[PDB]
Write an enzyme that holds these catalytic residues in place. Structure first.
Site, PDB file in Angstrom:
ATOM      1  N   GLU A  50       0.893  -1.144   0.000  1.00 27.60           N
ATOM      2  CA  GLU A  50       0.000   0.000   0.000  1.00 27.60           C
ATOM      3  C   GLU A  50       0.935   1.199   0.000  1.00 27.60           C
ATOM      4  O   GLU A  50       1.927   1.222   0.748  1.00 27.60           O
ATOM      5  CB  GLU A  50      -0.885  -0.012   1.243  1.00 27.60           C
ATOM      6  CG  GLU A  50      -2.234   0.645   1.045  1.00 27.60           C
ATOM      7  CD  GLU A  50      -3.313   0.093   1.956  1.00 27.60           C
ATOM      8  OE1 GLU A  50      -3.189   0.234   3.194  1.00 27.60           O
ATOM      9  OE2 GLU A  50      -4.304  -0.455   1.425  1.00 27.60           O
ATOM     10  N   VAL A  51       0.658   2.165  -0.874  1.00 28.94           N
ATOM     11  CA  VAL A  51       1.506   3.332  -1.025  1.00 28.94           C
ATOM     12  C   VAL A  51       0.780   4.605  -0.592  1.00 28.94           C
ATOM     13  O   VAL A  51      -0.376   4.809  -0.948  1.00 28.94           O
ATOM     14  CB  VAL A  51       2.121   3.427  -2.445  1.00 28.94           C
ATOM     15  CG1 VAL A  51       3.082   4.587  -2.525  1.00 28.94           C
ATOM     16  CG2 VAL A  51       2.852   2.135  -2.816  1.00 28.94           C
ATOM     17  N   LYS A  66       5.796   3.339   1.381  1.00 27.58           N
ATOM     18  CA  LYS A  66       5.258   2.084   0.867  1.00 27.58           C
ATOM     19  C   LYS A  66       5.225   1.112   2.037  1.00 27.58           C
ATOM     20  O   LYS A  66       6.282   0.797   2.577  1.00 27.58           O
ATOM     21  CB  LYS A  66       6.159   1.552  -0.274  1.00 27.58           C
ATOM     22  CG  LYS A  66       5.792   0.179  -0.800  1.00 27.58           C
ATOM     23  CD  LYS A  66       6.846  -0.193  -1.855  1.00 27.58           C
ATOM     24  CE  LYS A  66       6.624  -1.479  -2.589  1.00 27.58           C
ATOM     25  NZ  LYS A  66       7.664  -1.633  -3.648  1.00 27.58           N
ATOM     26  N   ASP A 154      10.276  -5.810 -13.547  1.00 24.48           N
ATOM     27  CA  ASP A 154       8.906  -5.288 -13.574  1.00 24.48           C
ATOM     28  C   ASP A 154       8.853  -3.930 -14.252  1.00 24.48           C
ATOM     29  O   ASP A 154       8.208  -3.022 -13.787  1.00 24.48           O
ATOM     30  CB  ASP A 154       8.279  -5.304 -12.159  1.00 24.48           C
ATOM     31  CG  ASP A 154       6.752  -5.140 -12.173  1.00 24.48           C
ATOM     32  OD1 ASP A 154       6.116  -5.480 -13.216  1.00 24.48           O
ATOM     33  OD2 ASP A 154       6.199  -4.683 -11.145  1.00 24.48           O
TER      34      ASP A 154
HETATM   35  C1  LIG Z   1       3.680   4.299 -22.553  1.00 23.52           C
HETATM   36  C2  LIG Z   1       4.862   4.290 -21.617  1.00 23.52           C
HETATM   37  C3  LIG Z   1       6.029   5.126 -22.089  1.00 23.52           C
HETATM   38  C4  LIG Z   1       6.669   4.829 -23.288  1.00 23.52           C
HETATM   39  C5  LIG Z   1       7.731   5.595 -23.731  1.00 23.52           C
HETATM   40  C6  LIG Z   1       8.168   6.663 -22.985  1.00 23.52           C
HETATM   41  C7  LIG Z   1       7.549   6.975 -21.787  1.00 23.52           C
HETATM   42  C8  LIG Z   1       6.475   6.213 -21.324  1.00 23.52           C
HETATM   43  C9  LIG Z   1       5.848   6.588 -20.021  1.00 23.52           C
HETATM   44  C10 LIG Z   1       6.462   6.190 -18.834  1.00 23.52           C
HETATM   45  C11 LIG Z   1       5.922   6.532 -17.608  1.00 23.52           C
HETATM   46  C12 LIG Z   1       4.757   7.275 -17.521  1.00 23.52           C
HETATM   47  C13 LIG Z   1       4.187   7.669 -16.181  1.00 23.52           C
HETATM   48  N1  LIG Z   1       3.963   6.528 -15.293  1.00 23.52           N
HETATM   49  C14 LIG Z   1       3.355   6.916 -14.020  1.00 23.52           C
HETATM   50  C15 LIG Z   1       3.328   5.677 -13.155  1.00 23.52           C
HETATM   51  C16 LIG Z   1       3.207   6.016 -11.711  1.00 23.52           C
HETATM   52  N2  LIG Z   1       3.241   5.075 -10.741  1.00 23.52           N
HETATM   53  C17 LIG Z   1       3.094   5.732  -9.531  1.00 23.52           C
HETATM   54  C18 LIG Z   1       3.044   5.297  -8.215  1.00 23.52           C
HETATM   55  C19 LIG Z   1       2.869   6.218  -7.190  1.00 23.52           C
HETATM   56  C20 LIG Z   1       2.813   5.765  -5.753  1.00 23.52           C
HETATM   57  C21 LIG Z   1       2.750   7.567  -7.518  1.00 23.52           C
HETATM   58  C22 LIG Z   1       2.802   8.007  -8.832  1.00 23.52           C
HETATM   59  C23 LIG Z   1       2.976   7.079  -9.854  1.00 23.52           C
HETATM   60  N3  LIG Z   1       3.053   7.238 -11.237  1.00 23.52           N
HETATM   61  C24 LIG Z   1       4.135   7.667 -18.698  1.00 23.52           C
HETATM   62  C25 LIG Z   1       4.676   7.330 -19.921  1.00 23.52           C
HETATM   63 CL1  LIG Z   1       3.862   7.872 -21.353  1.00 23.52          CL
END
Ligand SMILES: CCc1ccccc1-c1ccc(CNCCc2nc3cc(C)ccc3[nH]2)cc1Cl
Length: 327
Positions: A50-51, A66, A154
């Site tokens: 849980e975050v 976390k 992952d």
């Molecule tokens: C389609 C994926 C991709 C391909 C190529 C380049 C970048 C990315 C990408 C890489 C990362 C993200 C943003 N991901 C957010 C994930 C996230 N997990 C979290 C977990 C917490 C606790 C808080 C905020 C959080 N944000 C968005 C994108 Cl679009």
């Protein structure tokens, strides 16, 4: 039996570092003060944690806490050892503290805060330049952790935090990460379905850092072709069929034959016969601005069934796809 495999890079890292480095079970956890952090809000729940968004009252700084579920609490020493080993590394999330949560009574990891730009906004507005920029920042993190004898296992958008305003990226959730030891047979029940490498899908346990490179290729394909996830399997079996409908069945059979892997007979009635597809099929007027010959060549070199044939993170960094990226 299966033909053994070993990584083409960083095979010796964990044998030439002292036992203290990779023997996470022997490592002693020093606990901080749980009352130094006030929980602000729950951000999410998974099967292992849980975050929470929280505040460190001893400095007045926002943090992420976390709290590990009892199931993941069993393998906390591995995550803590990996996070301490990689701390300070390029684009690796920084572990700030470890405390015992008074409610769960399980370890709670305290991380630096990243003001994350909403996933949808990133997925919908990143330019061709930004995609290349952020992919290069992920490569720095993966080359670093691989060079340190660790596989992430992952890699997926959920595990990549981007603060677009500050052009800051962090690779998070090291809960499935493992030390790479040549010859070791690992659990194939790692990564999330859409990002699982063919090695996991065909139950080949002697995999290595290159699993992360397949997952990275999946992220790139999704972004440039506007299909999220790119390989959208209904389950682990259909996941391989989805891949084989793009990369073809012939290179898949050559892959399993190379390593003397016996495919699960349940694939016989679902895999079929598929030729490898040219990428232009996935290119439309809407996404053509994200596609270039360099993007396709780079993707072709990540999305390979043979884990040994994929670009390593360091090789990927000198690919022409990143020439336009300011270094
Ligand atoms: C389609 C994926 C991709 C391909 C190529 C380049 C970048 C990315 C990408 C890489 C990362 C993200 C943003 N991901 C957010 C994930 C996230 N997990 C979290 C977990 C917490 C606790 C808080 C905020 C959080 N944000 C968005 C994108 Cl679009």
């Amino acid at each position: 039996g299966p033909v053994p495999s070993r990584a083409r890079v960083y095979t010796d890292v964990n044998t030439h570092r002292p036992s203290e480095y990779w023997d996470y079970e022997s490592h002693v956890v020093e606990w901080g003060n749980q009352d130094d952090y006030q929980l602000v809000r729950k951000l999410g729940r998974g099967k292992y944690s849980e975050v929470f968004e929280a505040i460190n009252i001893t400095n007045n700084e926002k943090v992420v806490v976390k709290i590990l579920k009892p199931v993941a609490a069993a393998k906390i020493k591995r995550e803590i050892k990996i996070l301490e080993n990689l701390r300070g590394g390029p684009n690796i999330i920084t572990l700030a503290d470890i405390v015992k949560d008074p409610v769960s009574r399980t370890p709670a990891l305290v991380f630096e805060h990243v003001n994350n730009t909403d996933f949808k906004q990133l997925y919908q507005t990143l330019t061709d330049y930004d995609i290349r920029f952020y992919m290069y920042e992920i490569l720095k993190a993966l080359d670093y952790c691989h060079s340190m004898g660790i596989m992430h296992r992952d890699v997926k958008p959920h595990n990549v935090m981007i603060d677009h305003e500050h052009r800051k990226l962090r690779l998070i959730d090291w809960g499935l990460a493992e030390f790479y030891h040549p010859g070791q047979e690992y659990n194939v029940r790692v990564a999330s379905r859409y990002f699982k490498g063919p090695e996991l899908l065909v139950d080949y346990q002697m995999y290595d850092y290159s699993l992360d490179m397949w997952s990275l290729g999946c992220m790139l394909a999704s972004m440039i072709f506007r299909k999220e996830p790119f390989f959208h399997g209904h389950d682990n079996y259909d996941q391989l069929v989805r891949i084989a409908k793009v990369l073809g069945t012939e290179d898949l059979y050559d892959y399993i034959d190379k390593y003397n892997i016996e495919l699960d007979p349940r694939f016989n009635d679902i895999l079929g016969r598929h030729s490898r597809k040219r990428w232009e099929r996935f290119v439309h007027s809407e996404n053509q601005h994200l596609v270039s010959p360099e993007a396709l060549d780079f993707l072709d070199k990540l999305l390979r069934y043979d884990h040994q044939s994929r670009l390593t993170a360091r090789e990927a960094m000198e690919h022409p796809y990143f020439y336009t990226v300011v270094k």
